[PDB]
Amino acid sequence: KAVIKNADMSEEMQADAVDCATQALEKYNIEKDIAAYIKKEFDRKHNPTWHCIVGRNFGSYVTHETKHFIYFYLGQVAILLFKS
Amino acid sequence: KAVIKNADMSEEMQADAVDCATQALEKYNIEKDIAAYIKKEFDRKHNPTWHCIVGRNFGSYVTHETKHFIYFYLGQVAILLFKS
Amino acid sequence: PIFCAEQIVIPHNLADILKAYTKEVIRRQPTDLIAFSAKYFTNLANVA
């Protein structure tokens, strides 16, 4: 289940982020494949640039533009997503 | 010591990044602090936009501005440093 | 900094001891398992 530690986006876009994370965790095995799936899928619809990091032990320092950011847990993986 | 798994910068810039990371590693024992330190020093050193992720388990897919990217290990910790 | 399942260490000498342990129980088949187990482990510690 999605424990959203830190999000700065609207509700629908957050829900779509969680759904895309679920599909990525279901379909791919290695981490970079999941990251690329998330980033490319959010490039396809939301806005043309995105950045994603999937892992278990990390905390970034980014410069995201407001209204787009998430850092949440799915299963046992931390997914960090932001546009810049 | 330091091994550069991936680089897309000039030799001087990569050397400066390695120096920044090793300098950070003697001050900060929490990983977000290393991310912050690196992000500030490349923020003031270069064109202001930057991004840094540090950890021991993560996989990413970042669209980075050309001629600016690095992914390298110090000790046991991986650092991904790039510009949007 | 444990973050993955495989990080948990299973000692080399663990299972053998455990089997010996269950041996004693299934030899005596007692009812106050906790007391007898405490006595047995304390005996093993004090003799080792």
Partner: peptide, 17 residues
Amino acid sequence: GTDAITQIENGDLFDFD
């Protein structure tokens, strides 16, 4: 743009049992 800091803490993601 605005900044943001995240960090995986100890034991929050990893439920031992």
